[PDB]
Amino acid sequence: PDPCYDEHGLPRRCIPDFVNSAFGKEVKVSSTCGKPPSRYCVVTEKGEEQVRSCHLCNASDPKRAHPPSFLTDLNNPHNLTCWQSDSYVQYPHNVTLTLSLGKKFEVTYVSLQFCSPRPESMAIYKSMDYGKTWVPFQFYSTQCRKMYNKPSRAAITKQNEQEAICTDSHTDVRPLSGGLIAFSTLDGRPTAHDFDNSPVLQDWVTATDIKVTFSRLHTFGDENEDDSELARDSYFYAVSDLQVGGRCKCNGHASRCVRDRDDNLVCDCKHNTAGPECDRCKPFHYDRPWQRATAREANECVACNCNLHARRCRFNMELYKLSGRKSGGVCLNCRHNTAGRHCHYCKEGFYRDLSKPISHRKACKECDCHPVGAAGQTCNQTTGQCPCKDGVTGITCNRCAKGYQQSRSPIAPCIKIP
Amino acid sequence: PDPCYDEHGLPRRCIPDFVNSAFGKEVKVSSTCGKPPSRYCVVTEKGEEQVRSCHLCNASDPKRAHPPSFLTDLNNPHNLTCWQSDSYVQYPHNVTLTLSLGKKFEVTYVSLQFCSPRPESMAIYKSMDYGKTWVPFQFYSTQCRKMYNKPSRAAITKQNEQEAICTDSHTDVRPLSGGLIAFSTLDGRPTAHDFDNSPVLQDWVTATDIKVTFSRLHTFGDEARDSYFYAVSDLQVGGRCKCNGHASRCVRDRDDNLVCDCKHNTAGPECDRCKPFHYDRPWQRATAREANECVACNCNLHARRCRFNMELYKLSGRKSGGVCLNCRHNTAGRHCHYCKEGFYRDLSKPISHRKACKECDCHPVGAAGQTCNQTTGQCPCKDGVTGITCNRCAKGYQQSRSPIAPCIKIP
Ligand SMILES: O=S(=O)(O)OC[C@H]1O[C@@](COS(=O)(=O)O)(O[C@H]2O[C@H](COS(=O)(=O)O)[C@@H](OS(=O)(=O)O)[C@H](OS(=O)(=O)O)[C@H]2OS(=O)(=O)O)[C@@H](OS(=O)(=O)O)[C@@H]1OS(=O)(=O)O
Ligand SMILES: *[C@@H]1O[C@H](CO)[C@@H](O[C@@H]2O[C@H](CO)[C@@H](O[C@@H]3O[C@H](CO)[C@@H](O)[C@H](O)[C@@H]3O)[C@H](O)[C@H]2NC(C)=O)[C@H](O)[C@H]1NC(C)=O
Ligand SMILES: *[C@@H]1O[C@H](CO)[C@@H](O[C@@H]2O[C@H](CO)[C@@H](O)[C@H](O)[C@H]2NC(C)=O)[C@H](O)[C@H]1NC(C)=O
Ligand SMILES: *[C@@H]1O[C@H](CO)[C@@H](O[C@@H]2O[C@H](CO)[C@@H](O)[C@H](O)[C@H]2NC(C)=O)[C@H](O)[C@H]1NC(C)=O
Ligand SMILES: *[C@@H]1O[C@H](CO)[C@@H](O[C@@H]2O[C@H](CO)[C@@H](O)[C@H](O)[C@H]2NC(C)=O)[C@H](O)[C@H]1NC(C)=O
Ligand SMILES: *[C@@H]1O[C@H](CO)[C@@H](O[C@@H]2O[C@H](CO)[C@@H](O)[C@H](O)[C@H]2NC(C)=O)[C@H](O)[C@H]1NC(C)=O
Ligand SMILES: *[C@@H]1O[C@H](CO)[C@@H](O[C@@H]2O[C@H](CO)[C@@H](O)[C@H](O)[C@H]2NC(C)=O)[C@H](O)[C@H]1NC(C)=O
Ligand SMILES: *[C@@H]1O[C@H](CO)[C@@H](O[C@@H]2O[C@H](CO)[C@@H](O)[C@H](O)[C@H]2NC(C)=O)[C@H](O)[C@H]1NC(C)=O
Ligand SMILES: *[C@@H]1O[C@H](CO)[C@@H](O[C@@H]2O[C@H](CO)[C@@H](O)[C@H](O)[C@H]2NC(C)=O)[C@H](O)[C@H]1NC(C)=O
Ligand SMILES: [Ca+2]
Ligand SMILES: [Ca+2]
Ligand SMILES: [Cl-]
Ligand code: NA
């Protein structure tokens, strides 16, 4: 059926599946070996000795070429997809990785599996928009204050839950190969248990781009020396899999994200909502403002009540809060000769045809006063009583009253009688 | 002071004095002795013999020149001033005397004094226009059928009271000097005792000019020295100036015309119509006990023109019938008594006041329409809005901003 609705047809909060938003995605890096072709040294241990090896990184040979595509391809522990940068991009220089998702995702984690020694200092940034503004998100480094000007392992308080935490944890050389770095956005967040009812954390987890900056790099004594190896050296960055798990952000009003008219990813919004993340909500559904989907309530925009007359409408906060936070939408351009907040009364020049229901389109008969016996041509919108002149009476003014006699005058049709 | 209104100022029927409309006025003649000066001859009597004479008539000598002026001048039984015609003007020749009065009188009598012997056949005509059409008014002759083709001494039917009658009374030669012929406009006339309620007779006596035609002259003697002429001492047409009972004097106009001092809110030459805006009741001739005045229209000081509808008058019980035209001052109705659509009666001012009808000052937010009640001025309020102009929220309703929904009900 539809996960956004129950078996009785009422709406319930729905959420897309959890996936790696980076699988198969293209990646943009500021470094990669191949142009020109160079060598790289890899130290592999065997019992106790080490003895480093040497290999060549061929830009053309698929069998010695490390393209950024290996970051988001199918990772296989028995046969890795290593991406290697250039040679000795040491501080202050830094290799940056930028991933564009083309859709607001609620990030749950960001993991980098390095087939070489993990970085001494890396930075993980996000983008709230679609690549214009970046925001700190996690930091790793042996000298937090010295390099990222962050205090080591800051205290996370409700006063500032979006703190970018720097840590000297996970920033160790060995394992010289296959080291992980996994950043969980909700770990240690004060209000992470009450996420649906914490907007600060919803903003904290939402992002459309992920930047990864590799600031410093681990080294040993081999740096100046003399045999520094001016053509390749063995210090470098290298990651075999880059994962960024999470969910497509739909504020709980979409079971799944689909492909746009222009191939862009967007929520298949339900509950009468619209917009890429089901933030706003469909036309004519503007009674009661838009809220996020919660486990307790579905909170879908409700349509305006216009007694089946007007089509457009529009939400009003004051009317909403002044009606007990129940109805705040007013109707627009009432058709069928009506008017008012809900198209509930007939406009001047017409009256309420009570014989027919207010929802009916003929619920507003015109005035139809009498050209001779009526003093005006604008009847009572409530009763349809035309203003009768002197001797004339009725609702349409087409007859004389008691003590008054009919006449052939257009001006004085009835006249009293003594 | 004015006889058209009593002490209380109530209008009572009034009439101009009874005068001789001929005195002074000039008569138009056709035959006057004097042209190539000739002579005549009057004849007297001595009991048996017919002693006659013969005198001269000059066209210049004051002491011998019988002019037409001698018909309407100061007349006295002594030193009598006589008009005379050229001698020998017997059948079928005519001697006419027209008199234009200038305005419609109600002729009462037509008198003639005859220095010569009275005529054998004479006729009195009149005009109710001004010399254009001339109708027969009385005939005098011995041979009526023969000459005027009128039945001698017929009867005045109520069906034809405007009938000229020929008669042989006053047609004798009896008085050679001083013959009187007088025509009473209402002799023989059936409804004469009810003149004041007899429109036929009122039309009959109305006349603007008068023509006396002399026809056959009495050859008296039977013996040349024929000398048979017409000679009238004084012509007296006595009557009142026709003002239909709404005037006490006739006076001279802004164009120098004899007309009526039309009172009783009437207008016109003979007070035959109502004055402007005094069209509430149909015009009638003043009666003794009635005075049928012209009554103005009550447009409560809001209209300049009035028009009369007889249908309205009759269904009104013969009361009013005047419909006002162009009700100004933002009013409408027969008598400009109610405020047209978009205005309302300000009952603080009086109906006659210019600002008796104010406008609709209906709040554009609190009102569902922009038309007052006209009687109350209240204007179509919407939902939780009260006030004549829909300017305030009601009880239990709270002000907002939204013009579509000004007031909203509280918890
Ligand atoms: O209807 S018109 O606009 O064409 O006016 C026609 C002429 O009437 C005058 C006065 O004429 S006068 O007798 O020679 O003094 O103005 C008057 O017209 C109407 C009422 O008379 S009506 O003929 O029944 O229409 C009034 O206007 S309204 O209230 O009906 O809207 C005038 O009042 S006002 O001047 O608008 O204040 C009324 O004049 S008043 O009330 O006596 O003061 C002439 O106007 S005038 O210039 O004051 O003399 C009109 O001729 S004109 O071309 O406007 O001059
Ligand atoms: C190495 O690390 C830094 C930060 O992690 C990466 O961002 C670079 O940082 C510097 C400032 O430290 C930026 O310099 C600025 O450039 C603009 C001109 O566009 C100028 O207006 C500023 O006054 C300032 O000088 C620098 O722009 C920024 N690098 C880029 C490409 O924007 C840096 O990218 C890392 N190195 C590499 C190769 O990625
Ligand atoms: C590995 O790299 C070498 C060169 O760095 C490639 O050998 C030749 O490279 C030149 C370009 O500089 C080409 O013009 C030749 O065609 C290459 N020789 C060939 C294709 O036989 C070498 O091709 C690369 N490995 C593979 C599989 O192509
Ligand atoms: C791991 O991948 C390598 C190569 O990607 C496999 O060795 C073969 O290498 C040649 C290169 O010319 C490829 O054409 C072959 O496709 C590779 N063999 C196979 C079965 O794919 C190596 O076998 C792979 N090891 C495992 C356990 O899958
Ligand atoms: C009849 O008509 C004229 C007007 O009177 C007379 O002419 C008069 O002739 C006398 C004789 O010389 C003159 O003295 C007068 O000048 C004329 N009269 C006037 C008034 O001017 C004519 O004679 C008259 N016949 C008689 C008898 O009076
Ligand atoms: C009639 O008016 C005339 C106007 O002149 C007058 O005629 C005079 O009559 C008397 C005798 O009656 C004579 O003595 C005179 O000669 C006439 N001439 C004048 C100049 O007076 C007179 O006033 C009146 N005549 C009569 C009879 O009353
Ligand atoms: C007799 O009076 C008759 C009419 O009563 C006169 O005849 C009319 O005279 C006027 C002249 O002003 C003409 O306009 C009319 O056309 C005449 N009537 C007809 C029917 O022709 C007449 O002048 C008098 N007759 C005589 C002989 O003197
Ligand atoms: C305009 O106001 C008058 C008077 O207020 C209306 O006439 C009556 O008003 C009372 C209330 O004031 C009502 O209860 C009656 O129903 C009204 N009619 C009668 C016969 O009493 C008048 O109807 C109002 N104008 C319009 C268009 O309804
Ligand atoms: C249309 O009809 C209704 C009922 O007659 C009018 O509303 C009432 O009008 C009277 C006026 O005397 C008030 O006393 C009542 O308080 C009104 N009812 C309510 C619930 O307030 C209405 O005014 C009429 N429309 C117009 C323009 O007069
Ligand atoms: Ca991989
Ligand atoms: Ca005289
Ligand atoms: Cl007749
Ligand atoms: Na080295």
Residue numbers in the entry:
A (entry chain A): 40 to 457
B (entry chain B): 40 to 262, 270 to 457
Q: What did the published study say regarding this structure?
A:
Netrin-1 (NET1) is a chemotropic guidance cue pivotal to vertebrate development, where it plays a key role in attraction and repulsion of axons, cell migration, regulation of cell survival, and cellular differentiation. It is secreted by axonal target cells and functions as both a short and long-range bifunctional guidance protein for axonal growth cones. The dependence receptors deleted in colorectal cancer (DCC) and its paralogue neogenin (NEO1) are crucial for NET1-mediated axon attraction, cell-cell adhesion, and tissue organisation. Heparan sulphate proteoglycans (HSPGs) such as glypican are cell surface receptors that modulate NET1 signalling by acting as attachment points and modulators to fine-tune axonal responses.
To investigate the structural basis of GAG recognition by NET1ΔC, we performed crystallographic studies in combination with site-directed mutagenesis and MD simulations. Our findings assign the LE-2 subdomain of NET1 as the major GAG binding epitope. The laminin-type EGF-like fold of NET1 (LE-2) is highly electropositive in nature (IEP: 9.64), and is characterised by a cluster of arginine and lysine side chains that spans along all four loop segments. The combined loop abcd mutant did not bind at all, validating the observed NET1ΔC-GAG interface. In summary, NET1 provides a remarkably extended GAG recognition surface by combining relatively short, widely spaced basic amino acid residue fragments to generate an extended high-affinity GAG-binding site.
